[PDB]
Amino acid sequence: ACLEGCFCPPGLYMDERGDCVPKAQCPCYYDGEIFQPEDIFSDHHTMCYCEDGFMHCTM
């Protein structure tokens, strides 16, 4: 619904530490694991990175 509470402006998104930040340093939550805004990351076969909040995986 259209709820009531404490938000921050649309350019800013909420971070875990109470502050809210733009989507540049908004971490990724792949498989529960909290990855930093720039984390290149790969097993042998898969290839994944965190750009701006989303986790871009490939194969």
């Binding site: 529960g32 694991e33 984390d39 990351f41 790969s42 097993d43």
Partner: protein, 164 residues
Amino acid sequence: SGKRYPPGTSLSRDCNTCICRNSQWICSNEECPGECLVTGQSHFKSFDNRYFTFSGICQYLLARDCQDHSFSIVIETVQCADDRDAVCTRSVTVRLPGLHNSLVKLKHGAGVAMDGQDVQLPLLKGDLRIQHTVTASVRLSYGEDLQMDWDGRGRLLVKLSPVY
């Protein structure tokens, strides 16, 4: 170490003490705890103060009690950058057969997950305590003969007392 001390003094290493008598330090040989250290990309330190490097990508066994089976630790390495010579630690898995045969897991953040369930810290069960240290790093403490450190960005440690 290139400096003079009078006789009768007692300087102490971290391990034990030594006293000067007739230009000859007398020293005890009582054991003192070890520290296996993972850090950086792939840089290990053994308990016996050996240093080396092994950039493999699998689930490797870091440590284990091997005459009885009080515990077992399992590192999990992954490539960690564009280069091939960059293999950092993502997670570590601890296993305590003394309590439920449970399975603790230290995740890539400061997070912990017992048996799939995420957990708020502290976690006083009977033996093992898990709590933050600076509020930016987890610390497991099973009994009085085992410690750990944060495996978020890959700086695992251990403290094994001389009973092992």
